Every structure is written in structure tokens, then in C-alpha cells.
Symmetry: D2
Subunit: 81 residues, 4 copies
């Protein structure tokens, strides 16, 4: 039903608060990964929350991210030869 | 100081055009990974660039991101809780 | 109760859609006035809606804006001598 | 073409810092007028700049804005509906 977002829909979803480390743990961890991929320093709010996340839950989320990059690599590899 | 970004600095860097698939390949790929991590549908402009991506360069970028997820697991491994 | 906004509160209120000419008539007219004050060209969406607004209602809103600039001038004049 | 702005162009021009009271006096005064038109409370940074404004320059800017409201009334006067 909803396979494509509009730019307006994404701006509605990605509020300024997430840049201060607000939001669901999965959103926060995805944003930290995004900044680290780009070597962009975190905000004070992101660094504060980075210190308080639960080790085991954060590790579980990151294993999921590692798998998802694997899925993306499978799509691109299966596209060329 | 370049250990922390201001929210102002991040809003400046992450211009609206990146939601239409504009920018350096590393920025584009980091955004695509971020959206896939969160199961957020891409925009038409993101999907068009995904479809026409230089596959070898994109694979190299994603391999680097996967190494960075490993580095994030290694940071969290050191914690007691 | 609410005499001051946070930056986050204002970003919540001022969605991307208003730059496309979406929103209450008063919001739209305030934005058109803001752009005209700065001699910034409108977007296609703003120019589209500018053509469809009701003359008498739009004029009423603008008379209110004219009065409000008068109130602001009264505050600044009463501050110096 | 400089008869229309893109939404992208406007997001570029209207940086987050202006919500903290940063920018050219004309930009600051246009934003203060816009918020007052809509009865939206200012931020602490906007209020601080309002309190310390160069009153003569600010009055000159607002007189120009009031002339522009007149020009907008003159445009709408010409319409049949
Ligand atoms: N530019 C963005 C956004 C954006 O510009 N949102 C805006 N919302 N309102 C805006 C605005 C700006 C000026 C006037 C009126 C409204 S811009 S949201 C967003 N989310 C992401 C990105 C960018 C933006 C890319 C970085 C990865 C996180 C996801
Ligand atoms: N920058 C603004 C806004 C803004 O940056 N909103 C954002 N919302 N989400 C953003 C974002 C950006 C990147 C990543 C995640 C979230 S920026 S809203 C807004 N509203 C006004 C102005 C600016 C902004 C000034 C012009 C007069 C209209 C009122």
C-alpha cells in the first residue's frame, strides 16, 4: 500500500528532537550508525544518550543493522554478474 | 572543538536535497541504510538513484559501513552494562 | 502559561508543506508577507494558492497585519525617548 | 529563473539559527512580524535580540514592511474576486 515516501512525509517523521538523541532506541541507534558511517561528530544530546543505552539491547539492534547491510550487499552483488 | 556537532551544524549539513537522493555517494548510501534499518520507504528520487548506482563503488561503501557496525559492537562490548 | 517557544516547538509547527502553500489562510498570508518583506520569490505551490485566495478575506487578513506592524512600531517608539 | 524559488532553495535560505534570533536585521524583523501575525510565542534567543535591537534601524525596517503590506492590498484591490 505504501512502498514510496514523499519528501514531505519524511520531513514529518524526522523531527529536530532526534538530532538531540530523542526517540525510539532503534531510531537513535540508526542515527548514531548514520553519523559514524559519515564520521560526523554527535550532538551533546546524542552523546548523553549514547552513555545510558542498555548494552545487550543496543548490541541486538546493531546485529540487525549488520544483517541489513548484508541484505543490501546481496541486492547489489546479484545486480552485477 | 570537533568532538561535538551543534544541532545547527547538523541541520546545515543534512539539506532537504538528500531526501531526493542528492549528494556524495557515501551520504546517499548512509541515508539508504538508515531508512532500511527503520523499514522507512524511500522517496522516488532515492529509489531512482538506487536503481542507477555505480554498483562497485556502492559495494565498497557498504563494506565500510559494515566494518563500522563491527566497531560499534566492539565499543559496546567493553561496557559492564 | 506559554509566553516562550523552544526552537523544537517552532520546527514542529512550521512543516515543509507551508513552503508549498499549504495550511490555514492566515498562515499562508503571513508566509507570503514574510517572503515579500524579504523580496524572496514564492514557490510554485505558493504562487498557485496566491491565485485562488478570496479577495475580501485576504484583504481583511492584511489589514490585521498592517495593524500588527503598527503595534510593533508603537513598542519600539515608546522604548526610545 | 528568479520568478520562482524551489522548496529546496527556501530550506537552504531559512536556516535553524534564524529561530534563535540569528541573521540580518531585516530577516530577524520579518520573522518577528510573521510570529506576531500568528500570535506564536518567540524563542528566548528571538526575545533577547528583540530586547537589544538597534531601535532606529528596526523602525526603518518595519516602516518598509508596512509599505509592503500596502502594496499587497493594492495587488488584491485589482482582482474582481
Ligand atoms: N532536511 C531534513 C528535514 C527537513 O528539512 N525538515 C524540515 N521541516 N521543516 C522545514 C522547514 C524549513 C523552513 C521553513 C519551513 C519548514 S525543513 S527532515 C530530515 N530528515 C533526515 C534528513 C534530512 C532531513 C537526512 C539526514 C538523516 C535523517 C533524516
Ligand atoms: N529551519 C526551520 C525549520 C526546520 O529546520 N525544521 C526542521 N525539522 N526537522 C529538521 C531536521 C533536519 C535534519 C535532520 C532531522 C530533522 S529541520 S522549521 C522553520 N520554520 C520557520 C523558519 C525556519 C524553520 C524560518 C522561516 C519562517 C517560517 C518558520
Amino acid at each position: 500500500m505504501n512502498r514510496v515516501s514523499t519528501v514531505q512525509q519524511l520531513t514529518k517523521r524526522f523531527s529536530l528532537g532526534m538530532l538531540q538523541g530523542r526517540g525510539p532506541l532503534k531510531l537513535f541507534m540508526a542515527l548514531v550508525a548514520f553519523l559514524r558511517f559519515l564520521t560526523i561528530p554527535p550532538t551533546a544530546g546524542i552523546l548523553k544518550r549514547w552513555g545510558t543505552i542498555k548494552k545487550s539491547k543496543a548490541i541486538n539492534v546493531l546485529r540487525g543493522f549488520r544483517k541489513e547491510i548484508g541484505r543490501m550487499l546481496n541486492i547489489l552483488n546479484r545486480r552485477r554478474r
